[PDB]
Amino acid sequence: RAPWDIKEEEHEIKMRFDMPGLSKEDVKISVEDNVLVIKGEQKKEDSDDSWSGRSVSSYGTRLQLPDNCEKDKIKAELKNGVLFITIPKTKVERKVIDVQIQ
Amino acid sequence: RAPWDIKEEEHEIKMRFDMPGLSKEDVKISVEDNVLVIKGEQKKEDSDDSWSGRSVSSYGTRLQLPDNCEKDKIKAELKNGVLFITIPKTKVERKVIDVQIQ
Amino acid sequence: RAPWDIKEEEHEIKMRFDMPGLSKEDVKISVEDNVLVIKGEQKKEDSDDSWSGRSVSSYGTRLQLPDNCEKDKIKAELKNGVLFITIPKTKVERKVIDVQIQ
Amino acid sequence: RAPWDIKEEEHEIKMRFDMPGLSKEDVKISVEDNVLVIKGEQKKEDSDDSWSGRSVSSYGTRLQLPDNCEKDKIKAELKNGVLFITIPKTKVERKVIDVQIQ
Amino acid sequence: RAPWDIKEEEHEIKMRFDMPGLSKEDVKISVEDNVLVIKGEQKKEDSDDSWSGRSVSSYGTRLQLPDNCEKDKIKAELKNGVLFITIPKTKVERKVIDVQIQ
Amino acid sequence: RAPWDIKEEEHEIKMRFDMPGLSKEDVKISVEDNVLVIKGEQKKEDSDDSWSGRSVSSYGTRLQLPDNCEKDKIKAELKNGVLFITIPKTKVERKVIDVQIQ
Amino acid sequence: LLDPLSPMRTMRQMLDTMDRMFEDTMPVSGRNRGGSGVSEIRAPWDIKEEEHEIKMRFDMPGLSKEDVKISVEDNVLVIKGEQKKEDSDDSWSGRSVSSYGTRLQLPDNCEKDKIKAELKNGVLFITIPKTKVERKVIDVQIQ
Amino acid sequence: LLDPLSPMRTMRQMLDTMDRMFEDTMPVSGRNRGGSGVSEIRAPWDIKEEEHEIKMRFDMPGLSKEDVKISVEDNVLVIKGEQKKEDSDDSWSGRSVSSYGTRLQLPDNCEKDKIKAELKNGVLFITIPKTKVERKVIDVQIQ
Amino acid sequence: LLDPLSPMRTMRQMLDTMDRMFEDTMPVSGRNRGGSGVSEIRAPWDIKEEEHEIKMRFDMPGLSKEDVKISVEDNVLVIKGEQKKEDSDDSWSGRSVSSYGTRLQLPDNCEKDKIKAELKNGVLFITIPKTKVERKVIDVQIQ
Amino acid sequence: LLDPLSPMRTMRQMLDTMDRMFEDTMPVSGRNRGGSGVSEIRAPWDIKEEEHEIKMRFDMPGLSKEDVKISVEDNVLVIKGEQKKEDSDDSWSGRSVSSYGTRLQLPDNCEKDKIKAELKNGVLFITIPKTKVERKVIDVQIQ
Amino acid sequence: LLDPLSPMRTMRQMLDTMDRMFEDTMPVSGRNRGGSGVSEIRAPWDIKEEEHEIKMRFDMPGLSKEDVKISVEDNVLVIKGEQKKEDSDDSWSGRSVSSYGTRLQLPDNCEKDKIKAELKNGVLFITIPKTKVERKVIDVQIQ
Amino acid sequence: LLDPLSPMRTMRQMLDTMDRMFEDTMPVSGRNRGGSGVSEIRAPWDIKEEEHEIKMRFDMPGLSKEDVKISVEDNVLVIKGEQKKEDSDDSWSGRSVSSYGTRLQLPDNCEKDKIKAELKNGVLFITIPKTKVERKVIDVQIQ
């Protein structure tokens, strides 16, 4: 599962993934054809360990970057069964939101 | 309610109506604009008498005659709560049906 | 609206009605054809007074008594917009219910 | 039928109505309880004249004004079967729309 | 497929199974965790022999006994493609049914 | 996929099949039990070659011939991914169609 | 057997159809109505004071008295019949009439000799004479 | 082309919509109605004795005569038009009006010179003069 | 809080329920109505000129004044209560009454001392006195 | 009568169920399946070369040979029967078994003397010997 | 409380979900599942011989031990918690996590001191030690 | 224009069809698919490293090169055509083929001279040569 978010600094894919039970070895982040790619495979773990949810397989996600994204400055972090990808925008531009807040 | 039938001699409207509780006074058959018309009104009867079904009102039906129908030879009969209209065709032509019968 | 209940002493129609805005004059209880009948009409009241719900009309309910009901001992009470009818059984027989209660 | 619109100068109800076959005599615009009201009745016209659509009756619409609307500067115009009501805002503020247009 | 029945003498699982094409070797009845268990596997038979219905696999059913059931007196019989399990109640108590029968 | 057609000369199965990617080796036409049979298997081809649609497997179609069909004069042709089977009727009899055409 | 007393129909009554029975099986999933066969002959019933001189008409246009039957079985009324089949050159004069049987539970056993049936104008009438009763007088309450 | 004679509509007629046509396709699964585009202009039709002085009004509020057209093609009436697009600061004074064309089959070929169309108060009227006829007199039967 | 001004209800108003709100969620898929709990007590509201002398009746047959409460919170009316539970030999004299609370937004803050509530004949009445106003006079236009 | 030749079933055949027949009546609105009564006894059919030594088993657990019948009528196979009713203290040893009859059209008229039926282990078997044929040899085409 | 013994679930068991319970309420018309709140944390359960060393994992990615709780009440396991709210510049790292509580009926009362819970890698584990039993030996039958 | 990058399709991607787009309009209420016209010719697409030597086959059995066209417009591929109509005694040799046009967005502008199309065995092939690229090398992370 993967959400699309926007920050002022960055989106393209300000993405997550729900990667639980993946090692960072098993994951690949890439840009191919200037499109983001997240792929990998789920392995096995300890028989002491449980999982309810979907099963194991390969998995592999493809996202259309803006043509003017910083492909070079893409970062990816994995912590606690999630991946986070960040693509820096060419210009930081927050969506303005005029909500009544003091 | 009114069925459309075909005979060899005649159709246009080889029609019935379900007219129950109508007098032939209360009914009109006509051709207007070269279209068949059946109209009339339901009245009341004896309080000794019962009817389950639809209520009473005026009623008035309009049927497209062939341009080459015998408007002059139209006949209408009323018996036992039905009207039958017959429009003679310009030529008797049965629909042929090839069914296996001896 | 009218519920059917059973007591040990009595049912047939251990009935209510929701009669709100009725006077006991406007209500009739009866047994006709050995069937219970509750009828009446709703009237008008003060223009100071409000009602949300169904409108006013006549109303008239018909209940099949046991052939061996005490038609003579039927009682009807009206309080606070409800009618209660009681038909005494020929023999008091509670439905036994074996529920675990101390 | 009545649309709600916004202009920079004004909304509240930057309303229309589809009033076809109404005279401006037959229409009332008002603010009651500080709410806009549009009411009136449809009449009859020439038997030479046709209408397909809904029938005739009274009609009567109620709109919540901003508490800080110019009730005094409300205007209503009727032309060609429509009413237009305009309520001036206390401050002209267009919704900004950043659409790519030269 | 397995029905739950009650007798006066016994239920818990006064059960059947539809076991057609099973040998009593291939079947196990047991109480584990004080729960009834029926398991086994379907095998193959003669190629002269036909079956329309579900396919072959393992199968394995689990039933909550009353805490005060006679686990010791459980019996199981297999005849003509059915299993019958009987769990003796601690006390024979028929459900009373008062039906009008002479 | 297979259409049933009628000609004057012939039907039974004036059939097609959509056989794309089949060789005539891989196809069998036959009459068994006096019923037409079309069977075969799909193979593989060049990896240069694409197909969108259903996958590959065996396939095998069974058609009830008239008892008085010319089983002997059955013909089958394969061109451009279709099979055509022709069963000669014992008597050429076109369905007559009386459509208004000059 | 139509029975006007029966809890299944809506009147103002105890059952109240809208309750458990109508809510439970709002869809007619299961047995057919026979509503096709009773459409052949729609029949009312009125009760007059003198009689269930059954104001039971039935509409059988074009029917002959050979084709209809009025019977009493179990002291219950029965109506049944079917218009004749088509002759070779039959003027239909109709839509499909066929096979129906309807039964009405009378509130009392009828004297079979007292019942009259007539067919005229495509209409059966059936008269059931009933016994004289005061009727259970209805007592009035005051508010 | 709306045709009031056409078997597809319900009147009392032969076709009777409730029959095979309505029962067969009670769902509108398939082609669209064009009921969106004709909602632009609801139009009646009345026939007077003197004329189909077509009591065909159409409601086009805010429409200009440049935007509407009345044509006859195949001797059939045609109504078509569309309100102008929005200007930069257009007072809508509306909901979305757009693109429609409606056609009505006249019972007789019209003289194109005899037809008048007027637009006033947001209302088109179209008048079709018809030929004088006795009309087929309707004979009466007795019971 | 029922609010008669609120865009969600149909009146003739701006919102017009039939628009986006009714078309969007024509099915009630999601949160429950509370229509079960408000069926306990159907209540109207009339506004007279002198007062929202709230012509707010509520039907609570067989209710005691201990079981009902009239409160004002946020200057909004509140009605709540529930018929007592069943005693061992309670004459029901009912269908299931239980747990409800309804709230109505008044157009103005009420003086809590001025409001009267009475219960008689199974009917609550609640009176809210309002302030005297000319009302915004309605100007007339000519055609 | 089950007939494996019949156009109504899907095989690879001419009819192709997915066509007009399945698309026309995808809902089973109308006559019942009898799928309830045939659930009593699921039966296959295999054809061997030597025979429709009908590899027609049927599962009738707990059935007696008095309760089942194998007949041939019109030279078509018939299977029918019903488990006995319940005795007073019957060990069900079942779910409801009842009333069924199934018929299979044989490709050829059977010799009634040649057919064997046996019941063992709750399983009927029925053997139909067929005549020796070369079978219509299947010619091969080349690509 | 999830209870694996409970008749409501399908296993091979007596209840058999497909029976009256599943057929009666095949639609989920009525109370909500709480399937939204349990989607927060999917959790299995395995039973080993030594223990319900509960092979109960739960997936709470990004959760802190302050936010989760493991309790035993009525000698039944309880899992509950919720990820913290968003900070001003929180890196989400998620979809919406919130408010859940799940309960599992243990087959025996647990010693609360013997249970261990650990959180690592976004995964809770909870271990329940059980008592040593022979288990009821399963007798075998012969055919 | 089919575009494999486009958010509307499911792959593993950002959009994820199952989200708002699929949940919002799970029914196809509105515009038609054109799935009828594209059923005429099912076509894949494979990308090889050397080329989108478009592994775009299309199945047009019985088609002539006069009836098909391969065009590039806006540097996008276009496939279109239709089998000829029926002659008087045409051997159908088919089901209804007709009118279709499909378009695929190439990831790069094609050299129109470099593209080859062939028709053989009822199969179009279209080859699009692409430019040589290292491809963006994929960096690896460690756990």
Numbering used by the authors:
A (entry chain K), B (entry chain B), C (entry chain F), D (entry chain E), E (entry chain L), F (entry chain H): 83 to 184
G (entry chain A), H (entry chain C), I (entry chain D), J (entry chain J), K (entry chain I), L (entry chain G): 42 to 184
Manuscript excerpt for this entry:
The small heat-shock protein (sHsp)4 chaperones play important roles in the cell by preventing aggregation of destabilized proteins (1–3).
Here we describe a structural model of Hsp21 based on a combination of homology modeling, cryo-EM, cross-linking mass spectrometry, NMR spectroscopy, site-specific mutagenesis, and small-angle X-ray scattering (SAXS). Because the result of this refinement exhibited a relatively clear D3 symmetry, we continued refinement of the reconstruction in D3 symmetry to a resolution of about 10 Å. The reconstructed density map of Hsp21, obtained from a data set of 18,407 particles, showed that the oligomer is ∼10 nm wide (3-fold axis view) and ∼9 nm high (2-fold axis view). For optimum fitting of the Hsp21 density map, a relative rotation of the discs by about 30° was required, and the distance expanded between the discs by ∼35 Å. Indeed, a V181A point mutation disrupts the dodecameric arrangement. To summarize, we have obtained a structural model of Hsp21 that fits both SAXS data and cryo-EM data, suggesting a division of labor in the chaperone activity of Hsp21 such that the CTR tails maintain the oligomeric structure necessary for the chaperone activity, and the NTR arms take part in the interactions with the substrate proteins.
